[PDB]
């Protein structure tokens, strides 16, 4: 059934984790 606002929040905060890892990998590939 309908995805709740809580499950949107958890999804967002989870998404912050591969944002950080993206930054790390980017910095590393950029010499």
């Amino acid at each position: 059934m309908e995805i709740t606002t809580n499950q949107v929040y958890i999804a967002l905060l989870a998404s912050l984790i591969p944002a950080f890892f993206a930054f790390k990998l980017g910095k590393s590939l950029n010499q």
Partner: protein, 731 residues
Amino acid sequence: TKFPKFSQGLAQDPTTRRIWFGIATSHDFESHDGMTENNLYQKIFASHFGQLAIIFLWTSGNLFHVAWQGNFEQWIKDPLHIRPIAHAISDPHFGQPAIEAFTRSQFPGPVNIAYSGVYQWWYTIGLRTNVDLYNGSMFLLFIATLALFAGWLHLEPKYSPKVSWFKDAESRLNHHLSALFGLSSLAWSGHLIHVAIPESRGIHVRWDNFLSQLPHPSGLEPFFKGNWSLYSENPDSLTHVFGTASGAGTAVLTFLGGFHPETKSLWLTDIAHHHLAIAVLFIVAGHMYRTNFAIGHRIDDILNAHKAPSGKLGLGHFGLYETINNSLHFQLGLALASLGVITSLVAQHMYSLSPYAFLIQDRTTMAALYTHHQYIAGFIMTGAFAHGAIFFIRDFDEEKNKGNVLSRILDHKEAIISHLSWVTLFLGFHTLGLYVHNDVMQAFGTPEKQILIEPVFAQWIQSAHGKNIYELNILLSSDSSNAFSASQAIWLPGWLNGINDKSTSLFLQIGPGDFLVHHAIALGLHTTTLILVKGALDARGSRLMPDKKDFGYSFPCDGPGRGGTCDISAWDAFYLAVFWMLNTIGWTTFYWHWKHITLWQGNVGQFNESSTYLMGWLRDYLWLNSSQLINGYNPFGMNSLAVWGWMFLFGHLVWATGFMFLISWRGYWQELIETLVWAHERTPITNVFKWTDKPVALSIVQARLVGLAHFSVGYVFTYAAFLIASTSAKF
């Protein structure tokens, strides 16, 4: 200034060239300053992890937006009558009528109808609730994370692999064939048998009950005794409703052939048998090369053995192993060629043997998916040839490859190019001829004097496959043949039901209109090949420039001398070939579309009659099916086709803007920009705003690329607008 730091030459440039050429050379790692082989392989490996993560995040976002803003559960109740939703619209620019126009479903607001076919695919493989989707989304976010971490980690000096690890071909081939292809195929068979097939028959199986729930009433005893047939015993009936137990079966592995009657899709137990059989092949394949256990083949030994005793191939495949192992561009070319072929395969096979439930009934998704995959295959096949040229310039050494097939193929390049030039000229002349003959016959009021050649060779092949509309009675269309009466055939009743049903697209009937377009496509394939082959075979040099390898893949020209030399580099051959590739996929998708649109509306006569002359295409395909699209917004009001209307004119504009870059060339603009620099410098007040990068006109190659990109985007955006709006309007 500083950017780009990988090129000092570019970073000393005092012009705006530095910026543009910095962005365009950033991924060409070999050409970077002070690049070593080690560092090259390590940056490739990391970027590969980055691509993987981007793909998993993309999937995660499709799952998320469909679980949150779509109507997946409603669609599951009524697949044939509810439109699936992609995402919501949150555009502050919209007016109240547009808000009322784009509001479709029970969602509170404007949405976009989805055409990607993900609803059909998720429903087929067992997902049934928005929580399912959401959990999938979260899993994929985690796998993304893992990829990004692996990327970083293997860039650290303790985990950075050495070049020998990268050059270990036999080990990679074993692992990739046995596990990546093989065990992932066996796993998918496991998913289908343990989750998807149950869900198709009503039983709800998830992570909290799968370890108990037996996927077959008899367990694994049949497997281990050798009574494998017990897994095929009671298949679903022809009265089965997908998702319920009404008319459902128990079998998990069959070979029925044809389609499930309600879903009009392949049977899932045949898809499970397929994935299991090929798993067994790939696992056996992956045990062929020699790694660290003394058994297996060494690839150089195979290569070095295969040489014809007549000497017609020279030294055969001698020396090729080091050539390919040491060249990334060879490897990329071979990969892209292979992928190109497989992508067209997926396009040609998914429309004819539809594997997803309720997808053939969704006409716009069908059209979109065929078009999408053939455009991607077209771009990928150009790339393979491009990277073939870059191999011949950057990595081919004639001393090492002396007498083998690569040097030989290079030694008779004029024969190849001239023969392709013949084929091209022959098809072009005759095929454009026959169309123009037929147009003039239609115009003078005498359609009986058209030349309408039957495609008898394709009708023969269709007859051999089992179509009985041509009364040819061969192989599967003869009752008395060995092929037909093969005892353990057993896929045949399903197959023959399918191939003789007008509703399915399993071998469509064909006639003269089919003969002409197939020759047009042939003309396009050969002509694209000719431009790309000339590119790759004249890459290292020609008579007009014998030292082309010393200038490289991409350079503007060699000046106006020797008669003039515009567009003489291999890059220019690629640039020329992209127009031919778009034209050729254009011809294939126009044919696919018009042929389906007439079949689905019922009037196949329209295609049969009109497709033999070019005014038929113009009038009964382009002109007629553009009526609703261009009324998406009118002086009276607007409907939900207004977005595709606007994207249709946008495509026209972007295509036309590309002609400016393609026709007007650089000097014109360099002289105009000099007058603007004068006006800026001499206008008071304003002068105080000074540039840091001296404004110059784009370069010669740059503008060929910018022109091509405007041309390509406008081509794609126009056709996709027309294709979706026309199909969705009438169906």
